[PDB]
């Protein structure tokens, strides 16, 4: 049987994963529970008495309503220590420049450019390739020599395809899996490797960088079943 070299290039996510609707709400609740149970902010430590910095902090803050004799407090009598209502959550409001974070969605994402690497930042992108036929697949390469190791050969092939734009890193010498068949007596040993910093851009007609959910749409069903578990969900 012919030995062939499968390669799937894994661009790892550059930001946090997006939270599930269930997850977000739960986290908010836990944060609010924490706040309710949180201690008083010891302002006396962080801000020295009779100082310009303290004064601004005081102005930003608003104090708690104290207990006073001859008055009904229908939400119980105020329990105060270090200037906080013990019965409730405390809120503490706070080059010289405002830290403005960048948008997590990108220009590429908006346009839906599949060849770009900046198109999904919270997901793991995988390099797919379209051959002479209409099928998509992970980059295949013929291993005729069999002198060098397999992963190294794969990397060299990728580099050749690129024209030395790509900068990859093999995770290991061990192959993740095999794609095998009876019609063509061959064996495609799949290597894993990580794109670190470069273009691809280019026999194969077209390519794309896709998440696990999009690969199912592009690639055949049997092929997907064979190589589903290899891909990360996020």
């Amino acid at each position: 049987p012919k030995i062939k070299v499968g390669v799937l290039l894994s661009r790892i996510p550059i930001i946090k994963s997006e939270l599930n609707e269930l997850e977000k709400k739960y986290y908010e609740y836990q944060s609010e529970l924490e706040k309710r149970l949180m201690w008083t902010f010891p302002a006396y430590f962080y801000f020295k008495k009779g100082t310009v910095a303290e004064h601004k902090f005081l102005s930003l803050q608003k104090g708690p309503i104290s207990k006073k004799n001859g008055i009904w407090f229908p939400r119980g009598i105020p329990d105060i220590k270090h200037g906080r209502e013990r019965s409730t959550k405390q809120e503490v409001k706070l080059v010289n420049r405002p830290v403005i974070p960048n948008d997590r969605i990108t220009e590429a994402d908006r346009s839906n450019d599949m060849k770009s690497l900046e198109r999904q930042l919270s997901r793991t992108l995988y390099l797919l390739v379209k051959d002479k036929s209409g099928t998509w697949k992970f980059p295949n390469f013929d291993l005729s020599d069999e002198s060098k190791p397999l992963h190294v050969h794969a990397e060299n092939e990728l580099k050749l395809l690129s024209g030395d734009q790509i900068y990859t890193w093999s995770v290991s010498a061990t192959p993740i899996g095999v794609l095998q068949d009876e019609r063509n007596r061959t064996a495609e040993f799949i290597v894993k490797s990580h794109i670190l910093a470069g273009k691809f851009d280019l026999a194969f007609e077209d390519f794309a960088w896709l998440t696990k959910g999009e690969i199912s749409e592009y690639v055949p069903k049997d092929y997907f079943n064979k190589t589903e578990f290899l891909l990360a969900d996020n």
Partner: protein, 113 residues
């Protein structure tokens, strides 16, 4: 009584201490308590499911690797030997960074070295 250094130490100690800084106990109604329990239990179940999914995936990957390596051993001994080496001092590349909360100004570097 005390020096300024002693005072500052006491203040520092206070920052860490629970003395007169902590609120009342979080009391709930019985209905509220139940609601909380149902929230927590469901969450725990979800977390377990996620763990199983990930664990299952890992097991599947391991099985695939095993299947591959047996095949490699059968076909080309040299290739199998090359694959199965001690990767003792293997280091993850310093470019594969831990994904931040929000992305940088330059999202991706196209040139290198």
């Amino acid at each position: 009584s005390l020096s300024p250094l002693a005072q500052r130490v006491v203040t520092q100690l206070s920052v860490m201490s629970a003395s007169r800084k902590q609120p009342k106990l979080l009391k709930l109604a019985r209905e509220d308590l139940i609601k909380h329990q149902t929230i927590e239990k469901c969450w725990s179940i979800y977390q377990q499911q996620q763990r199983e999914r990930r664990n299952l995936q890992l097991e599947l990957q391991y099985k695939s690797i095993e299947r591959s390596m047996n095949l490699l051993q059968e076909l080309s001994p040299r290739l199998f030997e090359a694959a199965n080496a001690s990767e003792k001092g293997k280091r993850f590349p310093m470019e594969m960074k831990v994904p931040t909360d929000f992305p940088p100004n330059t999202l991706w570097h196209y040139n290198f070295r």
